[PDB]
Design a protein around this ligand. Structure first.
Ligand SMILES: [Zn+2]
Ligand SMILES: [Zn+2]
Lengths: 429, 401, 718
């Protein structure tokens, strides 16, 4: 009656994410995710190491998507239609309303990079959203008459959760990306005294202990009082809104007159992502944007949205304003290799556009990583607040886990695992 | 321990418990099963009563109460007889039960079994009651109420050891159904289970909202015979969510009831139709009103006005009155009639998992639970699967325990 | 290679081995290791290692620094392997003990780095690249690596353990084309089948499964007759050690007439009787898939595939191994029926189907498992009475049965079947307690059973009047996925039976076309898309809600709306209108104005697809062009030509190229043809028809991103 865990992804890595857990008699999959930076069958997890059996519907019992980030949910239209799987998919309520837009926006990139060899289509994202079964926080739901799950509050994005699995005496809680600092946006994660047999946490900000909120405002202020334009490459949902609410506030409290622009094209959750935001925890200075006035001289702030400077508006806009010493770009996220936004963030100032051209880049370039993960203090705070019998680390770096594993081993006096990519881990009950 | 059983109904019990020196009479609500033998408001609709012929009430010491759905017989027990004991109950219970009692009398003085009571009795009855909270131990044995989660004020009573569970839920807003608090007992009385054991509640909730929105979207009127307190709240928190999610637009919700203002503690809650209602009355509309039995109340007026058109619709949600016999006095009829019984109680798949967690020694339930239902006589899972076998009882019986 | 990348190699090799810079990016190495394969596969490799004598010093440092990273080692092993794949480079890489040093105890094998599964997976995938010629064959035999692979095929990492068993099979088959290597391998396998623990047996049965199937040379035939005695002795223990690996062996052997020509079918026939009620199924279906088989075996195969159903059909009013499972518990009962209906469904569309294929009996057995699931059956025993208590309300068995009952309609049969089939289908729709995933399958079964009937006869029109009152109740369900599922049924039904006087009389008589039109304002965006598509179909058939107040309601969505899903669903409707032919210029002119002003790349791409349809109907010629310039097409096509989305630019490139052709075989045609010739198109087409990373995926820009660090750039969420 032992518990087995197999980090099919995100083991000592922050690329894919997939964790196959086998509680006493049931199999469960957590956070079927993806890996940008590739263009072939390597972007998805390897589910063949599960299909050495009967069909997936026969093997698995449920799938659980913690939040709407793409490294945690971006292989769902593939795993559920091409591989083939008919069964419950337990998200939360905002995650079900944000995933169809993120998966439809990434499909624009793949069809652009000529990478739709084994890939889902727009009809296959719809059919996959119909297998979803939304849940409510703290509201236990019944699976298979013996497998009982239940959500919690995590933070770090609108919709994230921290699921718990129960098959009776055995229990596994899977804390996805979560926060413990009570940020001014969402809040801190809270879990009750359940004491499961395992706790599957993450270790992104392992070796790291509101300076960022100010320094963002100061640098936009310092570049807009000199007749310079800002550019913020960002995805449709996620971080684009937590900045608009930040610029809108700071601007009425200073009575500015510079135009802000924002347009996605696939959605208007600029005033609907807030509708879901109210039950969890209308603009004046933010208008719509078009290609018409991306060249009229004057100070500006733009939120273009093909992502981490992929092909699209952001790349085409940045291509124009690159010849100016006063403009700037702000990369509010982590860019992967193989994209314009990765070279710029590290070194290179002489790119090459189509043809034999060479574009010189004289703008400023900043990097205000606005992610909100836990930290050495917060992780220790949760393991004590949760009181498990063993801790397992995923979704981090190879060494920062090794150091953090010692502290949890020694201080809290409990055995902590650090399984590699594909290593099963058995622990008795 | 000689449990006298005064009523046979499985949902509205009446059980007297004899002890060393104390006597306890739990859950003493009426039986509306008889008020629809008569004709609507040619006689006076008369109510049943627990069989008091088995024992006198001048010997009863205390009277416990779990929830408001079984209290309407409290007048007949503490006023007409020589009862001289105390009565315990819970705060939000008596606040609601008082409201239901005022509605019933208001309906009937407008123009063995006994006639209906008057405002004089209820005030004197609702006076001699001592109110408690959850876990507040009370002395006498040492009885104490717990949380059942069925209704707002709804408590199971554990006497000390003998446990008692009546009308408890597990699908929740109220306080959770605690389970560790009632284990390690000698015997365990378990009454008040669901009456639609097959159909899940969530199916019927989506069945209420779907038949509703199918009519108002076609220019029709929907009449929903319901109580002012009880299941009406769960209908409204689901109807509000439905209107916001499915997109019903601009349909009035007239919750007309004699006692409605204090009943909430765009739903307009007018006090009666004789008044400003006949002026501000826009169709297509929805009217949660009347009394479930259809034998009196405002619904008798609505049931006659709309009953002559195939566009209108009436929907039943009280899983207690057979809608086929409660509707016969109106035939012939043209208005669609739909049965959508929303019932949130302990299902049979739920009650067994309770026993294999609480693990009692002896359990006792009415005859209607130790036998499969009269419809699906073949289904052997729709029955209390317990070991050892449960000591059944019937109307006017004396068990040995 | 090329000069740009070449001059950048020496710096690359220096930074990879240096102990001061941060470790290189794992993604970058994989993208770099894939580059080398491209070069060496099309040219010679020994010429390369001399022309650029810096790679060897990188390989040579691997066994000298003793402090390399965990991931630079893995890169080098796979790089040493991919170079020493041709015989010329395999020997040239030995002057200095390089290859026997890397894959030997001196290298990363004997140190304290054989602990990270990244290096191991690199060691194995290093060998598999070089083991392609006889020189390497002798290298694997003498120094000892087959003895090492035996220890790697037990690893705690499924990624390593399964790649080792894929190397024994590559070494074995290369050894023979008994020789030295082969004789030792077959000995260890044959010694593993006789083990006592399950993992050792599973490791053997997976080396055998890949042998038979990847090589049919007559040396494999000799191997089967030698191992069959021990393989057959596995069906004699209390638990069969590895059942699903055991079964997979019998099927890859059986699907080859060579091996099947006496001891094979005797084991197969004995397996069908001794395997438990979890693997007897997967084996019994594999048999029925084959053309060559003893008829006495198939008759036993089919009869053990129908056994779970035959128990249900007899325990309700109209084998101990099976009757026990269906009653053992709820999990095992729902388990055995879901697998049986899946198997029996993969079987029907086959031409090698068993015969006679029982149609009437299977349907009656499938309909009587939908009622038990629903809850309105009638027992005929104590096992039938126990079945109602288990199957009642089981969504997994109801989904499996509803997919099957949809499959059992492509074989022609009497109409007695259809009446019995629809009767139980319609009961699932007009019922509470059907989940939104069951209603999606009931709506898909009901459609195959209608479109496969023998105007519209005497019985279909009656079922319709019973049906549409159920469709009205579903377009109002409190779930967007049910209101969506019922609008794709009303669309497909109206796409076939749209011109039947009977269907149009049962449709308009109900309230369906009015509910289908109040859903153009549903809050969910997936239901506006389905409602717009249904109205588009329902209006091509002339069944508007009791004709142009729709085009005014649709054109409003295309302009004033939030989401993209309704907008790109509106464009498909307007295109289907124009092509079918349901004042034309004013239509195309109004639509191509809302497309060009839009912000989604799907709405614009369909704009040019709406132009092509309109362009074809137009191409005496002077007005044809004058009309074509009146709608504003040329304003649209030229703006999209230089656009921020490469998929949108191709559609406009293909458009003008099609326009520059027709305008040749026949403002003014002369002047506009200049504006068409003045700009280049073939050069544009060749640029647009390539990936959007032809600069950032190049080996030049890949190399620079690895040796030009030193900025702010760690790994985080996308
Ligand atoms: Zn995240
Ligand atoms: Zn992540």
């Amino acid at each position: 009656p032992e518990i087995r865990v197999t980090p099919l992804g995100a083991g000592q890595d922050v690329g894919r994410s997939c964790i196959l857990v086998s509680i006493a008699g049931k199999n469960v999959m957590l956070d079927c995710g993806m890996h940008m930076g590739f263009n072939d069958d390597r972007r998805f997890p390897d589910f063949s190491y599960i299909t050495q059996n009967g069909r997936l519907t026969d093997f698995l019992d449920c799938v659980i998507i913690s939040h709407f980030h793409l490294d945690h949910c971006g292989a769902l239209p593939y795993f559920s239609e091409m591989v083939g799987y008919d069964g419950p998919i337990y998200m939360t309520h905002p995650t079900q309303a944000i995933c169809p837009i993120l998966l439809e926006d990434y499909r624009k990139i793949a069809v652009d990079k000529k990478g739709e060899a084994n890939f889902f289509t727009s009809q296959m994202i719809k059919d996959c959203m119909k297998k979803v079964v939304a849940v409510h926080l703290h509201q236990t739901v019944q699976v298979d008459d013996e497998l009982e799950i239940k959500a919690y509050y995590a933070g770090h994005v609108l919709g994230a959760a921290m699921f718990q699995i129960k098959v009776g005496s055995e229990s596994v809680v899977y804390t996805g990306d979560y926060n413990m600092t009570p940020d001014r946006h969402l809040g801190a994660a809270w879990i009750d005294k359940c004491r499961p047999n395992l706790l599957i946490t993450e270790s992104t900000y392992a070796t790291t202990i509101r300076c960022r909120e100010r320094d963002f405002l100061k640098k936009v202020h310092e570049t807009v009082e000199r007749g310079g334009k800002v550019l913020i490459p960002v995805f449709a949902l996620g971080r684009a809104q937590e900045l608009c609410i930040l610029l809108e506030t700071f601007w009425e409290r200073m009575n500015l007159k510079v135009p802000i622009y924002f347009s996605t094209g696939l959605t208007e959750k600029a005033n609907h992502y807030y509708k879901l935001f109210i039950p969890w925890t209308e603009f004046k200075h933010i208008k719509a944007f078009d290609r018409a006035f991306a060249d009229n001289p004057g100070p500006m702030v733009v939120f273009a949205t093909p992502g981490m400077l992929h092909a699209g508006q952001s790349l085409q806009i940045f291509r124009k304003w690159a010849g100016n010493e006063k403009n700037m770009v702000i990369m509010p996220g982590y860019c992967v290799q193989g994209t314009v936004g990765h070279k710029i963030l590290s070194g290179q100032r002489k790119l090459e556009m189509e043809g034999r051209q060479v574009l010189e880049v004289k703008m400023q370039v900043e990097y205000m990583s606005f992610s909100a993960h836990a930290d050495a203090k917060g992780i220790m705070q949760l393991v004590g607040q949760a009181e498990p019998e063993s801790v397992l680390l995923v979704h981090g770096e190879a060494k920062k886990m090794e150091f953090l594993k010692q502290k949890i081993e020694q201080e809290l006096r409990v055995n902590c695992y650090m399984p590699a990519n594909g290593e099963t881990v058995t622990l008795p009950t | 321990m000689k449990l006298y059983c005064l009523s046979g109904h499985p949902t509205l019990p009446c059980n007297v418990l004899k002890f060393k020196s104390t006597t306890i009479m739990l859950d003493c609500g009426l039986d509306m099963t008889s008020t629809l033998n008569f004709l609507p408001l040619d006689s006076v609709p008369e109510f049943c009563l627990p069989e008091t012929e088995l024992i006198d009430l001048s010997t009863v010491d205390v009277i416990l109460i779990s929830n408001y759905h079984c209290m309407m017989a409290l007048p007949y027990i503490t006023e007409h007889t020589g009862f001289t004991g105390t009565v315990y109950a819970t705060e939000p219970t008596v606040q609601i039960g008082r409201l239901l009692m005022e509605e019933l009398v208001n309906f009937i003085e407008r123009v063995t079994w006994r006639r209906c009571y008057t405002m004089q009795e209820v005030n004197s009855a609702l006076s001699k009651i001592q109110l408690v909270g959850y876990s507040q131990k009370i002395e006498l044995v040492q009885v104490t109420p717990l949380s059942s989660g069925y209704a707002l004020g709804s408590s199971n009573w554990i006497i000390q050891k003998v446990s008692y569970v009546s009308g408890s839920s597990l699908l929740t807003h109220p306080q959770p159904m605690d389970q560790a608090s009632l284990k390690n007992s000698d015997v365990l009385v378990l009454t008040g289970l669901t009456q639609i054991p097959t159909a899940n509640p969530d199916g019927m909730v989506g069945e209420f909202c779907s038949n509703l929105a199918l009519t108002v979207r076609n220019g029709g009127n929907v009449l929903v015979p319901c109580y002012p307190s009880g299941v009406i709240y769960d209908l409204l928190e689901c109807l509000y969510q439905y209107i916001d999610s499915a997109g019903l637009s601009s349909v009035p919700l007239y919750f007309i009831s004699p006692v409605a203002n204090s009943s909430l503690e765009k739903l307009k809650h007018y006090p009666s139709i004789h008044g400003d209602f006949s002026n501000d009355f826009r169709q297509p509309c929805v009217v949660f009103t009347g009394h479930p039995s259809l034998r009196f109340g405002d619904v008798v007026h609505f049931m006659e006005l709309w009953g002559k058109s195939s566009l209108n619709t009436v929907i039943f949600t009280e899983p207690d009155f057979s809608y086929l016999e409660a509707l016969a006095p109106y035939q012939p009829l043209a208005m669609k009639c739909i049965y959508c019984p929303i019932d949130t109680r302990l299902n049979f798949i739920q009650v067994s998992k309770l026993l294999k967690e609480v693990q009692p020694l002896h359990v006792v339930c009415p005859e209607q639970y130790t036998q499969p239902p009269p419809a699906q006589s073949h289904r052997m899972d729709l029955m209390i699967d317990c070991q050892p076998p449960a000591m059944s009882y019937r109307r006017a019986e004396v068990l040995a325990l | 290679m090329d000069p740009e990348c070449a001059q950048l190699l020496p710096a690359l090799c220096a930074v990879l081995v240096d102990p001061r810079q941060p470790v290189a990016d794992d993604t970058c190495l994989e993208k770099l290791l894939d580059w080398f394969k491209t070069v060496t596969e099309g040219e010679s490799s020994v010429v390369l290692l001399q022309e650029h004598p810096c790679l060897v010093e990188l390989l040579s440092h691997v066994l000298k620094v003793q402090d390399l990273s965990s991931g630079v080692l893995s890169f080098s092993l796979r790089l040493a392997g991919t170079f020493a794949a041709q015989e010329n480079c395999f020997q040239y890489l030995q002057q200095g003990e390089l290859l026997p040093g890397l894959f030997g105890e001196p290298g990363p094998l004997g140190r304290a780095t054989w602990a990270v599964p990244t290096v191991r997976s690199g060691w194995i995938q290093g060998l598999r690249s070089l083991a392609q010629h006889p020189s390497a064959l002798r290298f694997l035999a003498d120094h000892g690596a087959v003895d090492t692979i035996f220890s790697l095929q037990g690893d705690s990492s499924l990624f390593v353990a399964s790649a080792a068993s894929q190397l024994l099979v590559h070494v074995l088959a290369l050894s023979m084309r008994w020789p030295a290597c082969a004789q030792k391998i077959m000995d260890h396998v044959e010694e593993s089948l006789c083990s006592a623990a399950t993992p050792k047996v599973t490791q053997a049965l997976n080396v055998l499964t890949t042998t038979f199937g990847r090589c049919q040379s007559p040396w494999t035939e000799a191997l089967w007759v030698r191992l069959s005695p021990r393989v057959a002795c596995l069906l004699e223990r209390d638990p069969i050690p590895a059942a699903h690996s055991f079964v997979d062996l019998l099927l890859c052997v059986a699907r080859s007439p060579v091996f099947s020509s006496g001891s094979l079918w005797e084991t197969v026939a004995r397996a069908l009787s001794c395997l438990g009620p979890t693997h007897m199924g997967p084996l019994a279906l594999g048999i029925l898939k084959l053309e060559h088989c003893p008829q006495a075996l198939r008759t036993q195969a089919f009869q053990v595939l129908l056994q779970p159903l035959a128990c249900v059909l007899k325990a309700t009013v109209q084998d101990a191994t099976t009757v026990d499972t269906l009653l053992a518990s709820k999990s095992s009962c729902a388990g055995l029926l879901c697998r049986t209906l899946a198997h029996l469904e993969e079987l029907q569309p086959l031409p090698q189907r068993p015969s006679p294929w029982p149609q009437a009996s299977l349907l009656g057995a499938t309909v009587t498992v939908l009622r038990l699931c629903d809850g309105s059956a009638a027992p005929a025993s104590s096992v039938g009475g126990h079945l109602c208590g288990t199957l009642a309300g089981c969504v997994r068995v109801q989904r499996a049965a509803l997919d099957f009952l949809g499959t059992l309609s492509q074989g022609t049969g009497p109409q007695e079947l259809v009446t019995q089939a629809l009767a139980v289908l319609l009961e699932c729709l007009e019922s509470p307690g059907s989940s939104p995933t069951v209603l999606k399958k009931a709506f898909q079964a009901t459609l195959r059973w209608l479109l496969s009937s023998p105007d519209l006869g005497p019985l279909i029109p009656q079922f319709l009047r019973e049906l549409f009152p159920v469709l009205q109740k579903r377009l109002c369900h409190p779930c967007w996925e049910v209101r969506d599922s019922a609008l794709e049924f009303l669309t497909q039904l109206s796409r076939h039976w749209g011109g039947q006087a009977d269907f149009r009389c049962a449709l308009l008589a109900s309230e369906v076309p009015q509910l289908a039109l109040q859903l153009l304002q549903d809050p969910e965006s997936y239901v506006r898309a389905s409602a717009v598509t249904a109205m588009g179909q329902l209006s091509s058939q002339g069944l508007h809600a009791p004709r142009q107040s729709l085009f005014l309601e649709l054109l409003h969505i295309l302009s004033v709306d939030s989401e993209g899903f309704p907008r790109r669903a509106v464009m498909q409707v307007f295109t289907e209108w124009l092509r079918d032919g349901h004042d034309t210029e004013q239509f195309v002119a109004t639509v191509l104005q809302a497309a060009s002003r839009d912000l989604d790349w799907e709405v614009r791409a369909q704009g040019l697809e709406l132009a092509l349809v309109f362009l074809g109907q137009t191409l005496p010629l002077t007005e044809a062009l004058r009309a074509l310039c009146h709608v504003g097409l040329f304003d649209f096509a030229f703006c999209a030509l230089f656009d921020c989305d490469r998929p949108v630019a191709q559609k406009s490139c293909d458009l003008l190229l099609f326009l520059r052709d027709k305008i040749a075989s026949y403002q003014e045609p002369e002047a506009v043809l200049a504006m068409l010739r003045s700009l280049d198109l073939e050069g544009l087409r060749s640029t647009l028809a390539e990936s959007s990373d032809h600069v950032e995926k190049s080996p030049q820009s890949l190399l620079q991103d690895m040796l030009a660090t030193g900025g702010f750039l760690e790994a985080d969420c996308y």
